[PDB]
Amino acid sequence: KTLQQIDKLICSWLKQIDNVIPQLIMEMTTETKRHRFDLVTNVDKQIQQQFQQFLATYFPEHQLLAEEKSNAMITNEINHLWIMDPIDGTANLVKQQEDYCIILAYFYEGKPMLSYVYDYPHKKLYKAIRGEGAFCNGIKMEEPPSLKLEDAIISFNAQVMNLDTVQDLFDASFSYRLVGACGLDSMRVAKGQFGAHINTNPKPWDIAAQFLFAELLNLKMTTLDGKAIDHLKGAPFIISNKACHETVLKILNANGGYQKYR
Amino acid sequence: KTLQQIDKLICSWLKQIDNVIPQLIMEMTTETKRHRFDLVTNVDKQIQQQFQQFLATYFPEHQLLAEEKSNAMITNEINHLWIMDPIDGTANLVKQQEDYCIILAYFYEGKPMLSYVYDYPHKKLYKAIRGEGAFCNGIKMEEPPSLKLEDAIISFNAQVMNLDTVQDLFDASFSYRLVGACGLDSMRVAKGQFGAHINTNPKPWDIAAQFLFAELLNLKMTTLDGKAIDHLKGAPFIISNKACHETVLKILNANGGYQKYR
Numbered sequence: 166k167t168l169q170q171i172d173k174l175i176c177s178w179l180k181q182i183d184n185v186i187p188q189l190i191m192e193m194t195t196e197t198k199r200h201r202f203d204l205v206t207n208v209d210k211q212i213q214q215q216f217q218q219f220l221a222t223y224f225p226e227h228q229l230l231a232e233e234k235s236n237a238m239i240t241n242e243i244n245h246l247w248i249m250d251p252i253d254g255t256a257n258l259v260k261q262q263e264d265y266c267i268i269l270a271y272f273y274e275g276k277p278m279l280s281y282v283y284d285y286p287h288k289k290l291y292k293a294i295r296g297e298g299a300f301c302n303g304i305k306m307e308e309p310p311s312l313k314l315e316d317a318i319i320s321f322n323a324q325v326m327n328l329d330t331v332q333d334l335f336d337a338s339f340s341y342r343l344v345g346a347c348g349l350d351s352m353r354v355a356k357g358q359f360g361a362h363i364n365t366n367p368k369p370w371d372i373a374a375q376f377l378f379a380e381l382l383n384l385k386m387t388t389l390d391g392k393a394i395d396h397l398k399g400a401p402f403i404i405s406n407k408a409c410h411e412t413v414l415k416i417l418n419a420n421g422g423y424q425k426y427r
Numbered sequence: 428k429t430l431q432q433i434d435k436l437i438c439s440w441l442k443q444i445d446n447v448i449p450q451l452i453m454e455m456t457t458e459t460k461r462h463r464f465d466l467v468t469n470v471d472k473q474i475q476q477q478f479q480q481f482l483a484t485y486f487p488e489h490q491l492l493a494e495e496k497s498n499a500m501i502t503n504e505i506n507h508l509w510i511m512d513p514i515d516g517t518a519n520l521v522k523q524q525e526d527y528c529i530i531l532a533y534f535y536e537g538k539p540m541l542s543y544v545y546d547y548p549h550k551k552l553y554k555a556i557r558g559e560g561a562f563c564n565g566i567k568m569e570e571p572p573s574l575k576l577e578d579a580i581i582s583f584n585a586q587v588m589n590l591d592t593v594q595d596l597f598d599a600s601f602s603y604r605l606v607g608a609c610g611l612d613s614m615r616v617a618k619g620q621f622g623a624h625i626n627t628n629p630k631p632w633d634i635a636a637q638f639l640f641a642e643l644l645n646l647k648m649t650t651l652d653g654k655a656i657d658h659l660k661g662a663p664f665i666i667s668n669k670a671c672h673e674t675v676l677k678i679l680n681a682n683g684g685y686q687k688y689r
């Protein structure tokens with residue numbers, strides 16, 4: 166069926182994008198979408214429009230669900246779907262020129278088959294391939310050791326939570342860190358550097374690649390109620406070492422839950 | 428004898444410890460100090476030992492103030508002084524093997540002359556040399572663009588301030604990130620990636636190198652009351668872009684200050 170051949174083409178596209186991003190940065194251009202903190206650049210747009218055109222030339226029947234376009238349009242009954250976040254970490258890109266990524270994920274009959282989180286700034290490509298595994302620049306990633314929460318660093322956006330449940334999380338974990346790109350905080354979970362990453366209101370594209378990684382590396386990836394996540398619509402989600410999953414959810418839901426209140 | 432000859436010696440020594448570090452990671456052991464989360468590893472100790480003997484054997488008159496030994500010897504009087512954080516971000520080293528550095532600073536008659544923040548995991552050596560300037564791997568750094576607080580990412584430890592000032596700092600700024608190693612959160616401010624980094628209780632080695640970087644790149648580095656800092660003792664401190672230093676200190680000192688009880 167081979168996914169290995171499709172992988173080869175995706176990786177070849179990613180090498181071509183390597184040479185293209187420098188000139189996009191060279192003529193960078195910033196705009197805001199819904200508020201002053203919601204950024205898009207020509208980089209985002211151009212990376213996306215280019216995969217779209219790659220998809221049309223090499224995979225004309227395949228559909229695309231991507232951040233910087235209408236997804237009117239995508240439905241529950243579609244055989245070949247690619248979910249794309251062309252730059253996950255746009256705020257990092259613009260403000261830092263560091264700690265953003267490209268997220269790509271291919272779904273066959275709803276089932277994740279290929280996934281890509283490309284940390285362009287560090288030249289590290291994490292990929293996952295149903296049947297072969299998950300890799301970082303080609304070296305095989307393995308299931309990470311067990312981490313109990315009290316031993317684990319954790320990552321979440323603390324601005325978007327009430328401070329009571331932020332505190333309970335600080336008190337229950339080893340320490341707290343933030344990269345600020347869902348892709349990259351998730352890959353830190355995947356490598357056992359963090360015990361868990363939480364995003365309370367992610368988009369489909371912000372989490373699309375992670376499903377396959379979570380599956381192949383024996384991580385947990387769920388709603389904040391422990392349920393399967395619909396990959397088409399987002400959901401408040403968590404990616405977690407298996408040893409600290411229930412505990413984080415329990416804390417998040419305790420005492421009336423994690424939502425702001427003021 | 429010249430500053431460049433000293434610099435040449437130190438980079439050379441830093442670069443040769445690339446070869447040592449991986450072996451020490453692979454045989455890594457851990458101990459705690461004043462509580463269970465105040466970690467120290469064989470890597471912290473070996474790196475310090477090896478520098479003390481490098482100093483013994485090149486600049487024998489020179490003294491060493493460093494984290495993993497006593498520094499009862501001192502006085503504002505000691506002519507040639509080195510301050511070293513053999514591993515800044517020991518928790519990160521331990522939990523992640525990423526986002527730690529090595530901090531060195533040379534002080535002649537109390538005046539900063541040479542500084543180093545070595546980001547070993549990414550092989551980025553930041554140095555500062557009075558007379559030549561500041562550099563990352565030989566690529567010269569220049570004073571970063573003006574950053575108002577509301578357009579800038581900030582970095583601090585939210586577990587150790589009262590949560591009202593945490594909230595105000597979130598509210599007033601573009602966003603919050605944390606690397607978790609003072610030297611590295613400090614280099615992100617030097618590169619213009621962050622508007623500011625705060626550490627409410629640094630030891631002298633956690634901030635030694637940053638004085639000169641701050642001087643040469645027109646950063647503001649003060650206590651949380653805006654005063655000069657004694658390199659020999661810590662103080663609660665900020666390193667900041669010029670355009671947001673004042674606003675950040677106002678926010679920290681507002682309403683009885685920043686500690687848990689105010």
Ligand SMILES: [Mg+2]
Binds near residue numbers: 203204205232255
């Ligand atoms: Mg966006």
Ligand SMILES: [Mg+2]
Binds near residue numbers: 232251253255
């Ligand atoms: Mg995006």
Ligand SMILES: [Mg+2]
Binds near residue numbers: 465494517
């Ligand atoms: Mg220490």
Ligand SMILES: [Mg+2]
Binds near residue numbers: 471516
């Ligand atoms: Mg240290």
